[PDB]
Design a protein around this ligand. Structure first.
Ligand SMILES: *[C@@H]1O[C@H](CO)[C@@H](O[C@@H]2O[C@H](CO)[C@@H](O[C@@H]3O[C@H](CO)[C@@H](O)[C@H](O)[C@@H]3O)[C@H](O)[C@H]2NC(C)=O)[C@H](O)[C@H]1NC(C)=O
Ligand SMILES: *[C@@H]1O[C@H](CO)[C@@H](O[C@@H]2O[C@H](CO)[C@@H](O[C@@H]3O[C@H](CO)[C@@H](O)[C@H](O)[C@@H]3O)[C@H](O)[C@H]2NC(C)=O)[C@H](O)[C@H]1NC(C)=O
Ligand SMILES: Nc1ncnc2c1ncn2[C@@H]1O[C@H](COP(=O)(O)OP(=O)(O)OP(=O)(O)O)[C@@H](O)[C@H]1O
Ligand SMILES: Nc1ncnc2c1ncn2[C@@H]1O[C@H](COP(=O)(O)OP(=O)(O)OP(=O)(O)O)[C@@H](O)[C@H]1O
Ligand SMILES: *[C@@H]1O[C@H](CO)[C@@H](O[C@@H]2O[C@H](CO)[C@@H](O)[C@H](O)[C@H]2NC(C)=O)[C@H](O)[C@H]1NC(C)=O
Ligand SMILES: *[C@@H]1O[C@H](CO)[C@@H](O)[C@H](O)[C@H]1NC(C)=O
Lengths: 866, 885
């Protein structure tokens, strides 16, 4: 499969864009709204579609492009939810567009080609003929798709020849225009259909006689009468040319808005008219404004002529290089359409009279196509051209909507429309064509372009808005599979497009837009629910599972370092032989340090064998969950069954969490009665866990004397927290007391920073400035720093007899200056590298915290920033 | 602290609801829209507020009630995001309510009490309103700054004034029923003259025995002589009448003003039902007819009326001083709502049935001699309602200026929004300092509009936004089963909150769509900003913090509830085996996992690395990166765990039983096959395999053992001709049937034929078919018969048993018929299967369980090996026992 850019993307988009709006409702819109507001409307209607094209290109470049069609790309790149929701709005837009083309073909057939073979009489004629055409076209679509696919080029050829003839006619108008006199009465517009000639009196047989216009306006067939309307006799009868050759005087005339009302009269601003009352038997003789015109009405009526940019990306499979051929083709088609509309708006505004443009059905002229008056070969080419264009566009929409419905139905996303996949032997849908025809019937029964157009606009605006919103969100939140390769693409453009198309969608009709948005939201949430039920098994619990998995997958990619550091704890509880929580104060302390916000996993090891001890593990899981719910700490609970507690602890420390939801702090208790008993298990297990948690670059919190920690019901009124930051680990040693006091239990305990040659003023200024950002502003008291005393910390981080001496002097200082303290925090030195000096390290740590009622030791990990 | 329901909740709510809208704009609203549509308006505006009150009660019952106020309950019960968003919309509503009350007090001062004291006399009225409103706002701000205590003392007085005013109105009506008052309004044809200028409404009067033109003549006709014919035709063509303006209660007047009478801007107020002969008129007469001031419709009346039913959140404002709040707040709020609704209904009907249809439409009471239209019917004198409404408006304004800065100060001290930290700098006593100034500035910006009919819709928009948010939050938290949300209200159901949200949204859009859009965007912006700040405070980063918070919330919500799903879908854990150089040995397992999941579901990929953790951290990190790259290649979306154990066995066990977080657990273990187990002398392989099998079968997990993984297709390969074979023997039918369907759903097996081979036959086939109908696979069913004692003994089987004995002897160095019987059966089964299913693409058969004795594993391996002998690709599945489908 290989065809170029032109005949694969460009020409289909052109064939889909050029519609009936140009022929039937451009002149009326230009005359009613002027040239300025016309240019503003065209610009507004091209900007939304251009930003949507930018989003479509950004979608069409990331990754490979699926070869199925124009709906499969959207789904593959935005998820089944988005793709499914977009498909239905697009399907409805396409079927109503087919309906609108049928109405246009009927209107062009019954008004100019042949009116004899035909208020509400027109509405009934339109209804009947539109139903007959819809039936015949549906049957044709059933039987003869091959002939449509063969003849599809002809419709584009006719459109191109028509537009070329219009522009050539304009150029011939510039120096020698055609003649099409429109008659005037003062500053009113007479319907030229009835009268033979517009003149009050005519000369027959050497004398003057009343003309048909007189007898039609005056019921008397004798000139000698004075029972007629005052407007007829008071004013004159003029014949101004309707096609003034290109000049700057006409473009000066029709330059300001001319919004009429329902039932008003089409008036030629710039002719002498003396007002007067009038009878009621004359109204069937003036041309009348048919519908109320405004700005929003014109937006709604014109918009369906710039839609169809998603029909270009429809031969993805038979493309040479889609990444470079789809975006350029779409944007070139958009630009070409925008320039044709700009040029046509200016040409119409500046070349034709401002009063003959407002006859929607060409009443000023003798029931001709108002836009067909200027055309070189003959005014008869535009009628046939627009007829074939409307028929071809209707046929192609009726061919392309059921195929899309069958595609959506076989994907099995929405379950209640499984039947619509009952394709033919060849694959052509069977019970989807009937549904489409029924919807087309429901649309034809309205039988008025000016009322079908706003619904169509709502559907297409909804589709485009959803595409743009999806692109913007997926670019913002770093979706895992979303990286576009487009050069001129930035999510700000898609955001602006979403805003613009939403503004249009609400300008046209607020209630219609609300209904469309509610339908879209309902289908979106229903797709999400069904997908959850299909992946996992349950509805609500499935929703929660899907949200969790999506969030974790999105969090996987990206730099794995956070600019700030907050403790996320893993509380290692130690269950008893009877499966009871030994120290329920660790859970209380964890709840006080977290305050119910953050991540808190609670692991525990049970010695034995997994093969025969599963129920014990589950029972312990329930026990820990209950005890954890009581103390009001919101966290998960893991229980593992190991053979020896050492390896269980290791596997728990290095493997807990899912991807980015990892812990970064291990809070383990203190070993009690280690020196009393002869079994040395306790201290070796403790030191081994310490050595294993410092090699994983994790913080460490060892609350000593856990039997004196407060409960939640207790309250403190007088007391002062004590910090004894010695040398290193400053960030977390300063961050802990603040997070602690953030709880009501320590709500007002005074903080005192004690910091063990050097300069006290520079140090004080640094500590104070650092505290300024934190805002704790706690008093700083720096005691003397003796290098000989801290030798133990300096040598181990970066002498056994010396160890004890330094520890006893430090303990003396702290116990004489901080004995009555509430909580004492000091950073502990690292364990020795030699595996045998563990007894000395334990004796050091024990004689260091001798006397303090409540002492918590923290060891930094080294990757802490603040 | 303990005070009852009445004097603690009921009276404050009553005092906050009854406002200035009733007096200044009730009669005008009733006359313009008729009685029926007025009742409909009142009903619509009471239903939204009633449903919001029910939701507020459901909020006020769950748990303990915080003693702070009306904002702390909402926050504690709905989360910082919701609570913060509600606080700002409520704050804006309260400050604009203060603005509206000041406007009402100014209007009542300049129009009825004393009109001479008007600086400007169009736009003169607007300029007078602007100046006087600014002066009042300044003076009220100073008073509120200095004297909050006296306000809290005098708060009862305002309610006393309101109650006496309403009682006087009803007394006037009841006195109207049998003997009404006198208030003649003069008429011209069918128009309405301003009675202020003329002395008497009569074209001519008799003075000194003769008739002379009256002031009305000189005002309508510039000539002071009767003998003139240069006046407008309407005056001479129609007579002048003097109808009573207060007709006593009857069914004829309530029958007259019963249908809508929406006028337009600048039209004339006409009395439908009087003889009128039309004619042209001059342009110097318009200053003498009463004129409609603004264009009237239905939506305009909804917008103007809504601010008279707001304030139901002021009842839950003495939370601390309550006896038992759970039983005292809802009943108090709902009783206040019911009383207000009944008073409005009764007053609408009374006005409709007691006053003329032409004097209701004078917004400023022009038909009567510049009186308060509602004050015409009042027993003691029309002077009680004027002063009553004046003092009530001042008091309500003062209380709003007292209660808005307090709410702002609470929000500022709560530290949710960071840029308004300064607004918590209260005085030494706690009275706000820089929150009062901001409130006064916003109130001035609101006064500069100077028109009740334009200020009321903004107020309504803010309050409607607050209520819609409360209702939506309540409904969502009840639906999704939030962990800490269990309300105790008896008559409460999430359908009611949903209906309330819909109705109040409809109201929010009827008044003015664009204003509603602006309000919704402000609310959404503050909601997302609060969420972002909470993320930055809990975790450390902005964007990544959002994802972590979403994950934690979802897992926590999924924690509670029944832990069994009605369906069973495989969630795999692929146990890869890394090489000695840390390279993936079998990268085909990842391919198979990607084909079986198809990128949707959970897939954890664990692996054990032998050694010591203390010195092998970098190896673990490198292996994790390697697995991530290799996993990205095979297009499988999953997480990756690597642990460092001492023996691979315990690593595998700890990996099997501990992977995930709460409810996001796996339920299927796919491990490969051990190759060369009997070839080599090291027996580690088969014991490791058997140990993992027994450990994964005792946890009730499914099992997938793809044998001969080197012949499985890749993703680029495609299959055109072939048929999957299932050889389901006895049990585990559900999963044995669910696997091939999920398999063929991938394009690699997109069209492989399924054949069900099953070792009364017709009844079983009918059952399989009916079961298959729901699944819809419709695969052909062939039931093969089962033979007995086909081969009594096999010589080769005996030789194999001897070989096994020799193996055991070698192991020792460094009943045969009964044991053989099982091998013989396996040989016969392998014969049938290999002769009827050799050419199959993929073969699935369920494997027997491992033996209970830990030593008979060698025989089990020999059995499993001779079973799949010859088959190119064979996958064995073992059920866990808790599988449902
Ligand atoms: C303005 O007021 C006058 C008088 O109050 C209204 O005209 C009165 O209409 C009644 C009803 O027909 C007349 O009663 C009878 O009129 C006939 C006419 O010939 C007379 O023959 C009878 O003897 C009897 O008077 C009454 O005369 C007539 N009065 C006048 C002065 O016209 C009039 O309808 C009111 N409304 C307007 C002028 O729009
Ligand atoms: C109050 O007095 C005014 C002034 O005469 C009355 O206005 C006129 O009342 C008639 C009552 O039907 C209206 O009749 C309509 O006339 C049009 C022709 O313009 C006709 O097409 C309709 O079918 C109908 O017959 C008339 O429009 C109206 N004219 C004006 C300028 O107001 C008015 O009706 C009297 N009553 C009330 C309740 O206003
Ligand atoms: N079997 C275990 N499972 C989980 N954690 C444990 C286990 N044993 C000890 N811990 C943790 O390690 C610490 C050391 O406990 P150890 O048994 O050595 O001292 P204990 O006070 O005598 O009891 C405990 O405080 C606890 O934090
Ligand atoms: N070190 C390991 N880490 C993770 N899984 C392993 C490890 N060793 C074995 N397994 C699992 O058990 C199976 C047994 O592998 P074994 O060592 O018996 O040889 P192999 O399967 O022929 O290669 C592997 O296929 C794998 O599923
Ligand atoms: C066309 O004729 C109508 C007939 O009156 C003109 O209408 C008048 O326009 C003047 C100009 O301001 C107004 O003051 C009158 O009140 C209008 N009378 C009516 C009955 O409409 C109109 O201006 C003429 N020219 C146009 C429409 O361009
Ligand atoms: C009507 O036409 C006559 C003759 O052309 C002319 O004299 C007269 O002024 C015209 N009326 C007006 C209002 O221009």
């Amino acid at each position: 499969p290989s065809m170029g850019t032109l005949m694969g993307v460009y020409l289909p988009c052109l064939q889909n864009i050029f519609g009936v709006i140009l022929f039937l409702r451009l002149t009326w819109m230009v005359g009613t709204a002027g040239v300025l507001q016309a240019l503003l409307i065209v610009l507004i209607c091209c900007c939304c579609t251009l930003l949507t094209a930018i989003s479509m290109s950004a979608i069409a470049t990331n990754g490979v492009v699926p070869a199925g069609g124009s709906y499969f790309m959207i789904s593959r790149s935005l998820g089944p939810e988005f793709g499914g929701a977009v498909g239905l709005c697009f399907y409805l837009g396409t079927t109503f567009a087919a309906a609108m083309y049928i109405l246009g073909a009927i209107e062009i057939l019954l008004t100019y080609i042949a009116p004899p073979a035909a208020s509400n009489a027109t509405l009934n004629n339109m209804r009947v003929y539109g139903t007959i055409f819809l039936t015949f076209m549906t049957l044709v679509v059933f039987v003869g798709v091959k002939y449509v696919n063969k003849f599809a080029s002809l419709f584009l050829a006719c459109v191109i020849i028509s537009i070329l003839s219009i522009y050539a006619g304009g150029i011939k108008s510039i120096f020698d225009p055609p003649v099409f006199p429109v008659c005037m009465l003062g500053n009113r517009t007479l319907s030229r259909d009835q009268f033979d000639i517009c003149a009050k009196t005519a000369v027959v047989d050497n004398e003057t006689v009343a003309t048909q216009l007189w007898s039609f306006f005056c019921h008397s067939p004798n000139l000698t009468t004075d029972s007629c309307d005052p407007y007829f006799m008071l004013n004159n009868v003029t014949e101004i040319p309707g096609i003034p050759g290109a000049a700057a005087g006409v473009l000066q005339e029709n330059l300001w808005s001319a919004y009429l009302e329902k039932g008003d009269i089409v008036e030629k601003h710039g002719l002498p008219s003396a007002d007067a009352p009038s009878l009621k038997e004359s109204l069937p003789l003036y041309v009348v404004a048919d519908i109320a015109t405004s700005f929003t009405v014109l937006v709604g009526i014109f918009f369906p002529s710039v839609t169809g940019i998603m029909a270009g990306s429809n031969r993805s499979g038979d493309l040479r290089d889609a990444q470079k051929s789809i975006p350029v083709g779409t944007i070139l088609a958009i630009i070409t359409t925008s320039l044709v509309y700009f040029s046509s708006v200016v040409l119409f505004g500046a070349c034709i009279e401002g009063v003959v443009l407002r006859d929607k059905y060409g009443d000023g002229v003798s029931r001709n196509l108002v836009v067909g008056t200027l055309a070189w070969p003959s005014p008869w080419v535009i009628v046939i051209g627009s007829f074939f264009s409307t028929c071809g566009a209707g046929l192609q929409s009726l061919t392309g909507a059921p195929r899309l419905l069958q595609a959506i139905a076989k994907d099995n996303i929405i379950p209640f429309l499984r039947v619509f996949g009952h394709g033919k032997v060849n694959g052509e849908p069977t019970w989807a064509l009937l549904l489409t025809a029924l919807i087309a019937e429901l649309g034809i029964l309205i039988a008025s372009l000016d009322m079908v157009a706003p619904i169509l606009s709502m559907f297409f605006l909804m589709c485009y808005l959803f595409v743009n919103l999806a692109c913007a969100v997926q670019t913002l939140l770093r979706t895992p599979n979303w990286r576009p390769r487009f050069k001129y693409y930035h999510w700000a453009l898609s955001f602006l497009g979403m805003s613009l198309c939403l503004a249009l969608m609400f300008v046209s009709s607020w209630y219609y837009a609300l209904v469309a948005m509610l339908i879209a939201g309902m289908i979106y949430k229903y797709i999400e629910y069904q997908g959850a039920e299909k992946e996992w098994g349950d509805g609500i619990r499935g929703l929660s599972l899907s949200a969790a998995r999506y969030a974790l997958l999105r969090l996987e990619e990206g730099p794995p370092h956070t600019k700030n550091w907050r403790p996320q704890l893993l509380v290692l509880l130690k269950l008893d032989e009877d499966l009871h929580v030994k120290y329920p104060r660790l859970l209380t302390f964890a709840s006080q340090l977290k305050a119910g916000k953050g991540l808190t996993i609670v692991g525990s090891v049970i010695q034995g064998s997994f093969l025969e001890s599963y129920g014990e593990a589950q029972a312990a899981e329930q026990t820990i969950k209950n005890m954890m719910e009581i103390e009001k700490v919101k966290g998960f609970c893991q229980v593992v069954v190991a053979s020896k507690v050492r390896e269980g602890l290791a596997h728990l420390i290095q493997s807990c969490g899912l991807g980015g939801m990892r812990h970064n702090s291990v809070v383990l208790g203190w070993p009690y009665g280690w020196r009393q008993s002869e079994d040395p298990r306790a201290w070796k297990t403790f030191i081994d866990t310490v050595r294993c948690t410092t090699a994983a670059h994790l913080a460490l919190l060892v609350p000593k004397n856990i039997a004196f920690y407060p409960s939640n019901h207790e309250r403190y009124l007088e007391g002062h927290i004590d910090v004894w930051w010695i040398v290193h680990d400053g960030g977390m040693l300063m961050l802990l007391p603040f997070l602690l006091r953030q709880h009501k239990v320590w709500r007002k305990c005074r903080m005192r920073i004690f910091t063990v040659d050097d300069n006290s003023i520079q140090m004080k200024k640094d500590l104070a400035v650092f505290l300024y950002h934190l805002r704790l502003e706690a008093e700083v008291e720096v005691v003397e720093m003796h290098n000989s005393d801290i030798s133990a910390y300096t040598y181990e981080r970066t002498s056994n007899v010396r160890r004890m001496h330094t520890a006893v002097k430090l303990n003396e200082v702290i116990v004489t200056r901080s004995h009555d303290a509430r909580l004492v925090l000091l950073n502990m030195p690292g364990p020795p590298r030699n595996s045998e000096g563990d007894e000395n390290y334990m004796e050091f740590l024990e004689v260091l915290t001798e006397g303090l009622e409540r002492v918590l030791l923290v060891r930094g990990g080294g990757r802490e920033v603040i």
